[PDB]
Design an enzyme around this catalytic site. Structure first.
Site, PDB file in Angstrom:
ATOM      1  CB  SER A 487      -0.948   0.001   1.200  1.00  0.00           C
ATOM      2  OG  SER A 487      -0.232  -0.068   2.420  1.00  0.00           O
ATOM      3  CG  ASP A 488       3.987   1.728   2.673  1.00  0.00           C
ATOM      4  OD1 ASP A 488       3.408   0.652   2.927  1.00  0.00           O
ATOM      5  OD2 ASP A 488       4.366   2.522   3.559  1.00  0.00           O
ATOM      6  CB  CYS A 489       4.859   1.380  -3.897  1.00  0.00           C
ATOM      7  SG  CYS A 489       4.015  -0.211  -4.023  1.00  0.00           S
TER       8      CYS A 489
END
Ligand SMILES: CCCCCCCCO[C@@H]1O[C@H](CO)[C@@H](O)[C@H](O)[C@H]1O
Ligand SMILES: CCCCCCCCO[C@@H]1O[C@H](CO)[C@@H](O)[C@H](O)[C@H]1O
Lengths: 764, 509
Positions: A487-489
């Site tokens: 979910s970060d990228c």
């Protein structure tokens, strides 16, 4: 004679042909040319080596200079702009800033834009390379794979960063560790190098530090487990890890669908190796080297009571009483039973299930599985089952995809980071004002790669109901060839796509279809906790009490996942940015998600006015993302809750010239110690300025911002870039990481918005 | 057993003995005629192994965990088939004998006034089923009328005594209030001698040490000296009362306590302290917070293990600060270290909304008053200080139409601070808020809100004396409630005593 070139060798590169997914979309390979040579350019390699060799003490890391050297001939910009310097509180105008941007942006965008990204690097910690050396030694292909010219490079890499006291470090900037020292000594000794006592061959120097620390029984569990396979340690000296954990109806409180993905994929080969009790052949080197290591005779010692001896230097999370009791009970429950009278059915079913799970996982991962250590262990796990097969050959073929070269000797890259750095650079470029407007071709040549980097296909086979989460239009951290949701990228990729969407079609090219973003939104909304925030891979499995069973003692929070503030801030700012374009998907759900996420950010705040992150080494790294994600929902500064705390914390802590700096030990101690000589770094100062800018302080009081901007122009190099070299990264509160492009990506991003926020008028 | 909380250990031990003995009372003719109407199905024609896990949706506050349920299910088949038809004679008999001797050793040291009505009632059955004809049973039967009580409604049962705590609070209020007529001196002396006589000085009979108990030396109880139970909350208020009465003239209040006994109290208070700040009530620390997963009950929370209480920390820090003014003469380098350790604990417990709730009074501001009282002692200012302004802003933002303050009994369990009780107010809560705000030095800052805060108190004053407001004004373990009858008068007088001292409010007539 080293040239950096994209792979483009999908048909038998070194030993076995492999299969790609997007025609080698960003594959990284390095080759040693046999006929390369230059009367003057080759002389720069010795200078690069000796500069690091002589400044190792002052500067621990080393930026990739020889890699960017190769791109100077391919793009002979030959730009001549002196470094603009301002002093005595002289107000700067648009002219100096535009000149600095013109000098520092054209070469940055011409550094590498053919593929659509820039080759990035991780942080060299000298921790997962000895596993590769042991694997290549045990497979018998060390001579075939490791050429003799690589031996000198790896020897120089080992020699370049060695602590004079004798005790190595877990990371590059470590101090007095036992795991790293022992692993480095064993890997250096096993590659056919004898014992000496000189500065270059410092085996005798390491002998004093190894012997005066109770032998090798004080290293963590990973070291004992690894040395038990190489005929150095004994299985009775480590802790039992039965491979029968994968046999359950998933109704017990402890099941494989509960633990973290990394731990599950790492300990499973360990479980198989422990179950099979496999020991490598005892070569004549092993028998002559096993005596010098231990302070006592090899076979004339005890192992049942030597299992619990933790060093006071490599101990971060001590074992609990319940965990130790469980291990002690299991030692007598399993070893007397499943070693002389093993349950044939149970053990064989467990081994078969482990083998089939590993085989199903590696096929879906395209043999580029997460982690160098995990891949190295999986290679041994598949080799001991069938030395003559195709999976082993294909695993052997992707080995050269991790080696890397720098100013020091050859290193090993834990994982790829091209997509993350490419997205950050694209965001910085689009945020910066298009002065010459010639960055359009590079923006398009990166945007098409970003579009091609999207993972759209489901994992092969029954990915669902196999201890995995559904992936639909997700993004990875390394490349599309991996196929791992993160979910970060995705949050940064969505922001980049939305910001590029409003750009004219005639300048950047075609645009993505508006239907694919719905899948990304659904995936992002899938990961969310019940109290706010979200994790990286899975939403939630159990409580925080599962960390009591941590086997390791040099890390923390490994068995179970946790919510990350940076990802929450990125997701909330992405969702806020989406509202401006078009509200057309779950209007009553995005607002609810934002409301849920808002209260999570307040809870994580410490009473001192700042909260630290998990990947960047700073108490302000997560503060920038939080402030960026907090001002989006209309949070003001004059009358708002918790907004002023971060601003006051940033203002109270500065350098003599307004700079900001920290230390690698600040995050592990959670004390925020900035006493590094009252110095500063360009990346950290840029992070602080960007975080303060989102608070609307440009119109409040830009006087502190003047020196904050002025302390950046002096560090600008006449040749371009910033020569500051620091890791600027942390991993699980103990390990460190390095990013080579953060020296340039963030200062340009800050300078782009510095003129946009505050005009700072000056006619001349 | 040396790890779990004292109350749980002393309550479940008779339960353990009763379960081990499988004792069932005689089935009187009333029992057989009443057991049919209760159950919706026939009494003996139902199942019981699969009926063990059926939790109501109304009385469920802390649901059981999967691991706890699995452990209970495994133990059900591990113990019942074994220790019921083929019981281990040695193990079971030794366990029963150890339980009996532990109960006997505990009740003798407690003078048969053991903690809790339920615990005493269960212990009475536990000792009766062992010997119906004895002296311990008769003495337990003799102290039964010590708990019954009468009120406006019918007869009730008092869980425990609270005379010492309320007496100390009233004495503190009286001494803080200005002695206008100066005739309260005889009453102050007649209470001070009782307070001096209420100090527990003797050790528990027998080997109290190494018997899952903590050392008591010059400690105070919550009910009376006849109990002999250490509690850091009451000791902190008792020490403050003694120190404040010490500076009073001898000729007006009488004799004074010896200055050597306070050292034992200081040592006892310093004995209880956690590694991260604050202190608990009975024991310093046993284990982590993961022990609460094994909670048998579902209508309570945090019963198996203890925790640090903010109110006790504030009382201890204000007592220690008050001690410095009289004479620094005991561990100068240790009290400062303890204060430094306790200071950082208070900041951590603060919620982002600017207030942190307590554990005994039903209010999000009950602990705020004690925290503010214990925070301004170390020189914490208001114009430039950390976390001081948060509580003041929280108090100012939440008021009634006339400046009053009010909450609801369900506010603390939900941790949301719902004040929607009809926009009403209570004298005790308003007095608590005014006292908490007064310690922040806001009297000289802006006393305009304080005017209505004081005016909303005079109207509630009864012509016959006292305040007729009737509310529980107490919570117990986030689900249970408690009532105090003298809080209607003790706190308003305390607030009015300092109201004139802080702000003169000059008015010739
Ligand atoms: C149905 C029970 C069959 C015998 C189980 C013995 C206990 C399990 O133990 C295993 O059993 C194997 C098969 O008998 C034997 O090789 C050994 O006893 C042991 O390895
Ligand atoms: C000294 C060894 C004694 C062997 C067992 C004694 C005979 C049975 O004795 C009973 O056995 C049952 C099952 O074990 C249990 O009730 C108890 O152990 C015991 O009371």
């Amino acid at each position: 004679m080293w040239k950096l070139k994209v792979a483009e060798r999908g048909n038998a590169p070194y030993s076995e042909y492999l299969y790609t997914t997007n025609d080698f979309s960003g594959r990284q390979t390095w080759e040693f040319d046999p006929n390369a040579g230059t009367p003057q350019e080759l002389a720069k390699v010795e200078e690069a080596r000796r500069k690091f060799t002589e400044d190792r003490h002052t500067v621990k890391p080393a930026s990739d200079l020889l890699w960017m050297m190769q791109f100077m001939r391919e793009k002979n910009f030959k730009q001549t702009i002196p470094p603009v310097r301002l002093g005595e509180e002289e107000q700067v105008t648009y002219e100096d800033l535009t000149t600095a941007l013109t000098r520092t942006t054209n070469f940055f965008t011409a550094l590498q834009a053919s593929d659509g990204h820039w080759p990035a690097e991780n942080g060299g910690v000298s921790f997962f390379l000895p596993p590769f050396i042991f694997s290549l030694y045990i497979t018998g292909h060390l001579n075939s794979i490791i050429t003799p010219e690589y031996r000198k490079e790896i020897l120089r890499f080992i020699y370049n960063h060695q602590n004079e006291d004798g005790g190595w470090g877990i990371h590059i900037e470590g101090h007095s560790t036992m795991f790293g020292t022992a692993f480095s000594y064993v890997c250096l000794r096993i590659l056919g190098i004898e014992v000496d006592g000189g500065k270059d061959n410092a085996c005798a120097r390491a002998r004093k530090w190894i012997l005066d620390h109770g032998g090798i029984t004080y290293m963590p569990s990973w070291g004992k487990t690894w040395l038990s396979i190489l005929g150095v340690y004994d299985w009775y000296g480590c802790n039992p890890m039965p491979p029968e954990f994968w046999l359950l109806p998933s109704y017990l409180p402890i099941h494989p669908a509960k633990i973290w993905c990394y731990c599950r994929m790492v300990y499973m080969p360990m479980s198989y190796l422990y179950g099979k009790r496999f020991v490598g052949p005892i070569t004549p080197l092993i028998l002559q080297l096993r005596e010098e290591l231990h302070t006592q005779p090899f076979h004339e010692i005890q192992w049942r009571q030597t299992r619990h001896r933790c060093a006071k230097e490599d101990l971060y999370y001590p074992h609990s009483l319940i965990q130790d009791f469980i291990w002690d009970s299991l030692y007598v429950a399993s070893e007397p039973l499943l070693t002389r009278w093993p349950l044939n059915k149970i053990r064989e079913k467990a081994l078969a299930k482990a083998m089939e799970h590993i085989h199903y996982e590696d096929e879906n991962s395209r043999y580029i599985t997460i982690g160098c250590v995990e891949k190295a262990l999986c290679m041994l796990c598949c080799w001991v089952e069938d030395p003559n097969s195709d999976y082993f050959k294909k695993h052997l073929a992707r080995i050269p995809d991790y080696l890397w070269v720098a100013e020091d000797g050859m290193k090993v890259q834990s994982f790829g980071s091209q997509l993350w750095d490419a997205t950050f650079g694209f965001q910085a470029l689009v945020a910066s004002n298009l002065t010459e407007d010639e960055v359009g071709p590079a923006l398009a040549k990166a945007y098409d790669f970003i579009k091609k980097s999207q993972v759209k296909d489901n994992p092969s086979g029954d990915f669902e109901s196999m201890h995995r989460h559904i992936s639909k239009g997700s993004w990875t951290f390394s490349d599309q060839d991996h196929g791992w949701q993160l979910s970060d990228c995705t949050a940064e990729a969505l922001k980049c796509c939305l910001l590029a969407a409003t750009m004219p079609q005639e300048v950047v090219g075609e645009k993505m279809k508006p239907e694919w973003v719905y899948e990304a939104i659904n995936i992002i909304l899938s990961l969310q906790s019940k109290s706010g925030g979200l994790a990286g891979w899975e939403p939630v499995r159990a409580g925080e009490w599962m960390e009591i069973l941590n086997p390791m003692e040099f890390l923390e929070n490994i068995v179970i996942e946790h919510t990350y503030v940076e990802c929450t801030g990125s997701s909330i700012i992405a969702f806020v940015s989406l509202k401006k374009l078009y509200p057309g998907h779950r209007t009553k759900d995005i607002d609810n998600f934002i409301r849920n996420a808002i209260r999570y950010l307040e809870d994580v705040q410490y009473p001192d006015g700042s909260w630290y992150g998990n990947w960047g080494i700073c108490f302000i790294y997560s503060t920038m993302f939080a402030l960026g994600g907090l001002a989006a929902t209309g949070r003001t500064y004059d009358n708002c809750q918790a907004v002023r705390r971060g601003v006051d914390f940033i203002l109270k802590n500065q350098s003599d010239d307004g700079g900001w700096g920290e230390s690698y030990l600040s995050c592990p101690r959670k004390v925020y110690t900035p006493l590094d000589g009252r110095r500063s770094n360009v990346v950290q100062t840029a992070w602080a300025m960007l975080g303060l800018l989102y608070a609307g302080q440009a119109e409040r009081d830009p006087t502190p911002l003047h020196r904050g901007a002025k302390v950046l122009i002096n560090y600008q190099m006449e040749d371009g870039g910033y020569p500051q070299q620091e890791i600027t990264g942390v991993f699980k509160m103990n390990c460190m990481l390095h990013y080579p492009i953060y020296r340039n990506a963030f200062p340009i991003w800050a300078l782009g918005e510095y003129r946009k926020r505050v005009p700072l008028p000056s006619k001349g």
